[PDB]
Structure 1
């Protein structure tokens, strides 16, 4: 049946994207942490 992942590139960028994270104190702290952790990708890979 219809499952939970239904990819949509626009949805993905507008929701978890670098600009979205930067707009908000919580998102900027996500970037602070993921940089501190050494994450190779700070934000979901998405094609555009």
Structure 2
């Protein structure tokens, strides 16, 4: 059926992961956004 979910450790991870977000302006942005703003955890945390 091929949905769109097949997760890929390697993938998903990579792609998304503390770092990256960081590395980025943007990413970083929202991130520290989320942080306070909300609490929670985060991607990679995932």
Q: C-alpha root-mean-square deviation of aligned residues, in Å?
A: 1.4
What is the aligned residue count?
A: 45
Taking structure 1 as the reference length, what is the TM-score of the superposition? 0.74
4+ runs deviating over 4 angstroms: none
Between 1 and 2, higher relative CO (CA 8 Å, sep ≥ 6) is seen in 1
5+ long unaligned stretches in structure 2: none
Taking structure 2 as the reference length, what is the TM-score of the superposition? 0.76
Which has a greater percent of helix?
Answer: 1
